[PDB]
Amino acid sequence: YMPTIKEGNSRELMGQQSMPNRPNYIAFRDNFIGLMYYNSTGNMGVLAGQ
Amino acid sequence: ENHGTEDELPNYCFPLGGVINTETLTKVKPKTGQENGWEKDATEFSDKNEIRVGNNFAMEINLNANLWRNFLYSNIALYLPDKLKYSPSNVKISDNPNTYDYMNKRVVAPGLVDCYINLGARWSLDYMDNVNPFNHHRNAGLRYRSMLLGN
Amino acid sequence: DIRGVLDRGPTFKPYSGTAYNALAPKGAPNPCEWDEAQKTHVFGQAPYSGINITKEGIQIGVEGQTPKYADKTFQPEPQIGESQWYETEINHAAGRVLKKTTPMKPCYGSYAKPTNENGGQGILVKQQNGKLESQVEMQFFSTTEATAGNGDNLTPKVVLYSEDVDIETPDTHISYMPTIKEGNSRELMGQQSMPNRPNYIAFRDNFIGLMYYNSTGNMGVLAGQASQLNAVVDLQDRNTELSYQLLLDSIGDRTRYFSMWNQAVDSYDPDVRIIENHGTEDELPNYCFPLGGVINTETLTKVKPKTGQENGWEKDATEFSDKNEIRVGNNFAMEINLNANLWRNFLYSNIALYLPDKLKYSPSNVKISDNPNTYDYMNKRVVAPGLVDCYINLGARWSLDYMDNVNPFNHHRNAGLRYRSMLLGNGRYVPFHIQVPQKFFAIKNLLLLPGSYTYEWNFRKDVNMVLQSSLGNDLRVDGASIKFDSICLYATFFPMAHNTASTLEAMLRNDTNDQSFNDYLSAANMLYPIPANATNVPISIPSRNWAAFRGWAFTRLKTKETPSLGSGYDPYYTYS
Amino acid sequence: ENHGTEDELPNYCFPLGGVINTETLTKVKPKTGQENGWEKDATEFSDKNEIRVGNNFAMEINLNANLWRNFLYSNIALYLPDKLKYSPSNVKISDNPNTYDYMNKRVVAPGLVDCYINLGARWSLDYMDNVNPFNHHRNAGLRYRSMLLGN
Amino acid sequence: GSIPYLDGTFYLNHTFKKVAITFDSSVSWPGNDRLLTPNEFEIKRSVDGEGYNVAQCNMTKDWFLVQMLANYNIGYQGFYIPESYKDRMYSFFRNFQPMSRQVVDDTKYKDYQQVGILHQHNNSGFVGYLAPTMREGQAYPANFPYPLIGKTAVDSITQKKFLCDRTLWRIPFSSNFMSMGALTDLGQNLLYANSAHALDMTFEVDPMDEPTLLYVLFEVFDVVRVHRPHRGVIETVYLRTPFSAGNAT
Numbered sequence A: 001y002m003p004t005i006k007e008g009n010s011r012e013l014m015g016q017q018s019m020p021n022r023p024n025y026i027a028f029r030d031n032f033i034g035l036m037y038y039n040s041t042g043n044m045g046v047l048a049g050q
Numbered sequence B, D: 001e002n003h004g005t006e007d008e009l010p011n012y013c014f015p016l017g018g019v020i021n022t023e024t025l026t027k028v029k030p031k032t033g034q035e036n037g038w039e040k041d042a043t044e045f046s047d048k049n050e051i052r053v054g055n056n057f058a059m060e061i062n063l064n065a066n067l068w069r070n071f072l073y074s075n076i077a078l079y080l081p082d083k084l085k086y087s088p089s090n091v092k093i094s095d096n097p098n099t100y101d102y103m104n105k106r107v108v109a110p111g112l113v114d115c116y117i118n119l120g121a122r123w124s125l126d127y128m129d130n131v132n133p134f135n136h137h138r139n140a141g142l143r144y145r146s147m148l149l150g151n
Numbered sequence C: 001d002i003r004g005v006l007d008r009g010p011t012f013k014p015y016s017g018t019a020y021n022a023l024a025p026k027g028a029p030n031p032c033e034w035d036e037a038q039k040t041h042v043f044g045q046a047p048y049s050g051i052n053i054t055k056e057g058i059q060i061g062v063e064g065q066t067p068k069y070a071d072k073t074f075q076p077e078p079q080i081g082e083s084q085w086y087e088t089e090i091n092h093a094a095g096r097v098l099k100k101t102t103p104m105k106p107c108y109g110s111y112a113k114p115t116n117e118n119g120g121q122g123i124l125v126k127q128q129n130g131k132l133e134s135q136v137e138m139q140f141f142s143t144t145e146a147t148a149g150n151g152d153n154l155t156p157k158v159v160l161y162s163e164d165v166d167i168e169t170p171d172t173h174i175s176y177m178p179t180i181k182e183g184n185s186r187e188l189m190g191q192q193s194m195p196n197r198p199n200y201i202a203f204r205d206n207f208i209g210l211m212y213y214n215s216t217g218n219m220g221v222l223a224g225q226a227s228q229l230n231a232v233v234d235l236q237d238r239n240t241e242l243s244y245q246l247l248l249d250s251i252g253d254r255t256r257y258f259s260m261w262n263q264a265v266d267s268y269d270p271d272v273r274i275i276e277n278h279g280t281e282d283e284l285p286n287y288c289f290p291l292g293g294v295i296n297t298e299t300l301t302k303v304k305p306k307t308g309q310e311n312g313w314e315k316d317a318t319e320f321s322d323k324n325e326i327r328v329g330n331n332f333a334m335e336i337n338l339n340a341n342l343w344r345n346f347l348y349s350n351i352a353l354y355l356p357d358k359l360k361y362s363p364s365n366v367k368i369s370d371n372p373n374t375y376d377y378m379n380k381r382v383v384a385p386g387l388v389d390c391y392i393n394l395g396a397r398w399s400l401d402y403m404d405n406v407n408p409f410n411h412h413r414n415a416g417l418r419y420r421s422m423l424l425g426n427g428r429y430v431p432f433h434i435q436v437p438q439k440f441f442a443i444k445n446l447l448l449l450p451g452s453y454t455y456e457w458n459f460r461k462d463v464n465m466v467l468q469s470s471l472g473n474d475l476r477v478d479g480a481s482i483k484f485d486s487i488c489l490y491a492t493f494f495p496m497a498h499n500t501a502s503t504l505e506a507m508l509r510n511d512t513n514d515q516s517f518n519d520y521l522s523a524a525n526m527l528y529p530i531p532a533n534a535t536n537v538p539i540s541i542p543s544r545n546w547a548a549f550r551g552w553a554f555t556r557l558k559t560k561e562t563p564s565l566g567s568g569y570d571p572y573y574t575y576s
Numbered sequence E: 001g002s003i004p005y006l007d008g009t010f011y012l013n014h015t016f017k018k019v020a021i022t023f024d025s026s027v028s029w030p031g032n033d034r035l036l037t038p039n040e041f042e043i044k045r046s047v048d049g050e051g052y053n054v055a056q057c058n059m060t061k062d063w064f065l066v067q068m069l070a071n072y073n074i075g076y077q078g079f080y081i082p083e084s085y086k087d088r089m090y091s092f093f094r095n096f097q098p099m100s101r102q103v104v105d106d107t108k109y110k111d112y113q114q115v116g117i118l119h120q121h122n123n124s125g126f127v128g129y130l131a132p133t134m135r136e137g138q139a140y141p142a143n144f145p146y147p148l149i150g151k152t153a154v155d156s157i158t159q160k161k162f163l164c165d166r167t168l169w170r171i172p173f174s175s176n177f178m179s180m181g182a183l184t185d186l187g188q189n190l191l192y193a194n195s196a197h198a199l200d201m202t203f204e205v206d207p208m209d210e211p212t213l214l215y216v217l218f219e220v221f222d223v224v225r226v227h228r229p230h231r232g233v234i235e236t237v238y239l240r241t242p243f244s245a246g247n248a249t
């Protein structure tokens, strides 16, 4: 809640109220999905006799 | 699954010191030889004493309803579709509708989901059926894989 | 397959607490005004702020240069006030108030239907010409000292819109009535309200009671089309439903829920029957502070050292205003105790109310019913919270003596019951549509063969049998009703190849491949009466054969809760 | 495992009667004829009517944070190693550190373990690693065996 | 966020309405008049006249039978809760939820008055206004929501729906919708393996205001054979039928 759009410090600004930010986790996926290329003819893997 | 709450009793909060609305009073002893009438006495009792009359002063609060309301607002109302929220006033906000900032600074009226919606009815809000329920902060697996890396 | 219309009666309430103004303190009244020895007194609130007040109302904006005033039908709304926490001065406040015709009820649990789209509530009335017109009066108030003078200016300060709503309370009741005398008066301002006891209602488990079993009066029939020879013969003591329950428990899991057959198992909370009482964890105090941080400030003036005086303290206000606010010492704050209150509320709400009736006592100045089965009587009795408080049997795993013989399945945490009640919706009028299985043991798994058969059965319409009710109100008195609309029968055929099916039929008509079926309970049932305060029950059985016996199994029931199976309708069975 | 608390909404108390800061007023009606004229009216309404201007008194409290803080102090902070606590003042205490009294009357500052330690981190305090976790009052088995004998 | 197409978290199954299948554009494949409805599988009805719903929800009987069969071979001898070990996390029966409620009937209640969000003042005097900010306003009897219980209740209508997430919808290519082995009896019949055919499917779904995708899995046979004739040499052969992909000399 911002009572006045002014700047600096003035009498009105004493009325403002605060509130916490939403929580937000970030981590790797399940089973590291997406960490290796599959089913993409551009970057197909290789396992073959030397 | 809204069963209401159990609030058959009032929950009060009393003054820190026990009573604050005291008033001053002075000792008195019955006059002898008259069958009535009285007189002052300062031989042993200080002539100033503090005493409260009537009950003590206390304020009320409904407890269970507040907890239920907090849970209901925090874990459902925020995740409503973006077409039900209005932008704030006198605050600079982003315009890209995917940034964290824009997703954070939109505001939503509590009246949309309060402690009386679909009372006594096992139901799920229509606005929330076609919104992904795995994007959440009670998603136990996600929270675990997030805490595993650290904080 | 069955469809029809169900009416659960006016004593259906599936939620604890209430749903209107639930956050309000349970004693605060509504803005009202009444009569005394004859003059009128007014009590109310005025939250709204304005600009200027004239005899037309209260200005709320400018349209061009012309002032714009309030719309007396839904203007200043009850939920709009100021926004800044720190108090300022307002000189033109407005508000709403109820006329003196409307009865006075506490704010807690007070409702009144809206009467126009904008959201205002006010009883419309007929005009001389056919038309509905609102009736809201305005009342102006000025400062006492201002009137205590001359009417040179005498401008009003506060404006109140007085109306008369159709107030009503749908789910609460008065727990304290200061005076029996009716009408509006000074006394009634003290009354207090509290919510009604929660009470679910639903169909039973596995639709017990919806079909007639073990009643040779209305026995079912399944027979060959032209033989007319019944194949179902039932005795008056082969209890069937309990056998089906036991079989369902034995062949599979039970805690899970299957909606199709309405298959949910009655069960009590594991912590209500027995009271594990550990006390509470309240080492720290849990204060509460003033909205503004501190409100007991005092005024002070800046002072600066002097020069050449060793104390010259002199005033100085060239830059700092002469009056500043400052608080000395700590700040005002009040105390509470959280966990104790939560535990106490749980104990009162889940155990104290369900005590035997003989401990409660009728209230004062409130009319009550007489049939001790009606919801009204069960709801308007009062029980002192001293019997079960936060200090009962401390440190002990124990259950109260009185609550031992009281049925623990008649409760409002019977998860099966609440599930079955929610499965029909939260309303009062329900169009329902269900499927009912078949439970007789001689045709439960029988494998029929080609032909034409006649199949006929009977269903109950009594309400005390087919609908449960977490309490026991005799539902016939409480206006419950159920009306059937249509029935249909469903069947499913395996698409077996023709010649293979012919071979199977031919093999299965040879009299050495007949079918054998055994009931699960497989026993004969007898009930005997026990009068009040008895201690010894002898029974006898005359001489007979005893080949291939198996054993005994006994239990004990209350007579108040056992219907008289064997006739069409038992009018002396009032419980549920 | 510290997710913090869900405290988006305030939880205000309220005065027992609903309002306590009223003030007196007198009914006034528009004097006819001259515009903007007003006059005192007391034919039907008493000269003393109580009305409150503005919002009503209320005090704020935080619920979920208080509950979590109470739990944290009760079930962990007390069981810290004895080397961190300090003796009380002006209270006689025992000298045999194995007694019940010595374990009871020592005090420990809540600041060591509050509602802001290792936020968002699934972790256990290094201090509590080498303290027996079965000597505790939430040990379900011990509680059951104690209640079985009696209270 | 979580990508349903990769880690299997689906939440939209409850928006299909009906499915129809045809071989060679003129022959319907429920076959030979099997289902209650003539030509297609109906997976949810809004308005019913002849009572085809089941489980106190809005799912036609059929579809219920088809799913129970194709997942547990249950349904030709009465319905019952399947065993725990045959009912995994991603199964069908674990993830079925029927729900119902009642609301005010505007056309029948003679005092209906639509009130927006801006003019509902329940719990009026002790809570903010269209924000979680500080409290405001005065106390007053509330005007929302209409009561549905008690002796002064309003007239009402009923709504029913179901929720079923985390699972795919299944249709097996058998003669009687049973699981009698990996290689079905209809995948071997000469008619479907010694000629050609053209396929036409038609889905009808409920509308949403966002571009979407329809996800179809054709269950097929995919097999690899591996041969190692010498030291440090490895040959492989792949087969995938019907949707073949490979060379041919």
Ligand SMILES: [Ca+2]
Pocket (backbone or CB within 6 Å): C297, C298, C299
């Ligand atoms: Ca002062």
Ligand SMILES: [Ca+2]
Pocket (backbone or CB within 6 Å): C298, C299, C300
């Ligand atoms: Ca001063």
